[PDB]
Amino acid sequence: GAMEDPFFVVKGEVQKAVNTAQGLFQRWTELLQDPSTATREEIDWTTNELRNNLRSIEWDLEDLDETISIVEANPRKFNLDATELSIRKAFITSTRQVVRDMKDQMST
């Protein structure tokens, strides 16, 4: 009953969420910089959907980070390539900051 490792599946979804968020953030910036086009409703909607993504991404990263601890506590069971694992770790860490950097330029 061997199972397929879904880590890389969720990883791709997080990246996809990070890409959408980035597009939303650049939009937010362009709105908040020029209140010529920047109507309140559109600003509210953009800030809201940017949060909708930052939300999914943070839960996602929590879970992903935990699976790392699970593999490290039970390595024999999972049989993961060590370079691959280090990449998993670097993905979690770098995505954390990428998102963190968006949140900083927002909440201030």
Place this chain on the structure above:
Amino acid sequence: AHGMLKLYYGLS
């Protein structure tokens, strides 16, 4: 995502 990870990793 949670359910996929839970199924394979046994999230607590």
